[PDB]
Structure 1
Amino acid sequence: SGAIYVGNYRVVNRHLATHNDWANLVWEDSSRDLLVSSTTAQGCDTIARCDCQTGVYYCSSRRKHYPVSFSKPSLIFVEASEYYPARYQSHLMLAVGHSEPGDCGGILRCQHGVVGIVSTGGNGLVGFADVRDLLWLDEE
């Protein structure tokens, strides 16, 4: 679990969104495993606007934050799970690191702010859904 709170927005993994999130839906994309809903209170996170390929992510299954190098956001094939059949997931970045399904939502950050959230994993790899291209998250 985990979410990003920027301005009047809440960013979560699409597969973990709540009834309030869908009722207050701003934008969602199944192919990215992302969902954004509106909030009443102002959040305090900053989204990074950069091309960083190094950062730190939180891994709940190890209660640990790990420094990682990660790939550029890309269209990557993702195996079937409890929430999606096998498909291509867009805007996905991989790193060598530990992750388990419940680790989804853990933040990846660089010196500039939040880069994305854990979305995939398996075989010593961890994948993050990028949020740096969602420029509208910085306004209104």
Structure 2
Amino acid sequence: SGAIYVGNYRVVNRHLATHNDWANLVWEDSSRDLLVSSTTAQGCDTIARCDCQTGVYYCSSRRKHYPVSFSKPSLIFVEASEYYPARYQSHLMLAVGHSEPGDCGGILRCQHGVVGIVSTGGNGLVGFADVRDLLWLDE
């Protein structure tokens, strides 16, 4: 679990969005596993606007943060799960690092701010849904 709170927006994994997220929907994209809902309170976070490929993510299944080197956002094949059929997930960044299904939502940060959230993983890999291209999160 986990979310980004920026301005009057909440960014979550689309597969973990609540009934309340859907009732306050701003934007969603199944191909990216992202959903953005509106909030009444002003949010706690800064979005990175950069091309970093190193950063630190929170891993809830270890209660720890780990440093990672990750690929640029790209179209990556993701096997079928209970939430989606087998498909290419777009704007995904992969790194070597521990993850389990419930780690989805953990934030990845660089020195500039929030880069994305855990969205996929397996066998010593962890995949992050990028949010740096969503310029409107800051408007």
Q: Same fold (TM over 0.5)?
A: yes
Post-superposition Cα deviations, 1:89-112, rounded to whole Å, max 9, x if no partner, equal 000000000101000000000000
% identity of equivalent residues? 100
| Cα distance between partner residues in 2 of 1:117 and 1:82 | 19
Give the aligned partner of residue 117 of structure 2.
117
| Cα distance between partner residues in 2 of 1:30 and 1:83 | 10
| Cα distance between partner residues in 2 of 1:16 and 1:44 | 20
- Answering whether residue 20 of structure 2 is matched by residue 20 of structure 1, we say yes
Task: Return 5+ residue gaps in structure 1 as ranges.
Answer: none
Give 1:123 deviation, angstroms.
1.4
| Cα distance between partner residues in 2 of 1:83 and 1:28 | 15
The number of aligned residues is: 139
| Cα distance between partner residues in 2 of 1:120 and 1:85 | 14
SS at match of 1:49: coil
Post-superposition Cα deviations, 1:14-73, rounded to whole Å, max 9, x if no partner, equal 000011110100000000000000000000200000000000000001111000000000
Could you list the structure 1 runs, at least 4 aligned residues long, displaced by more than 3 angstroms after superposition.
none
SS at match of 1:35: strand
SS at match of 2:58: strand
| Cα distance between partner residues in 1 of 2:42 and 2:67 | 29
SS at match of 1:15: helix
| Cα distance between partner residues in 2 of 1:101 and 1:84 | 14
Correspondence 1:57-72 to 2 at 5 A = 57-72=57-72
Higher strand share: 1
Task: Return 5+ residue gaps in structure 2 as ranges.
Answer: none
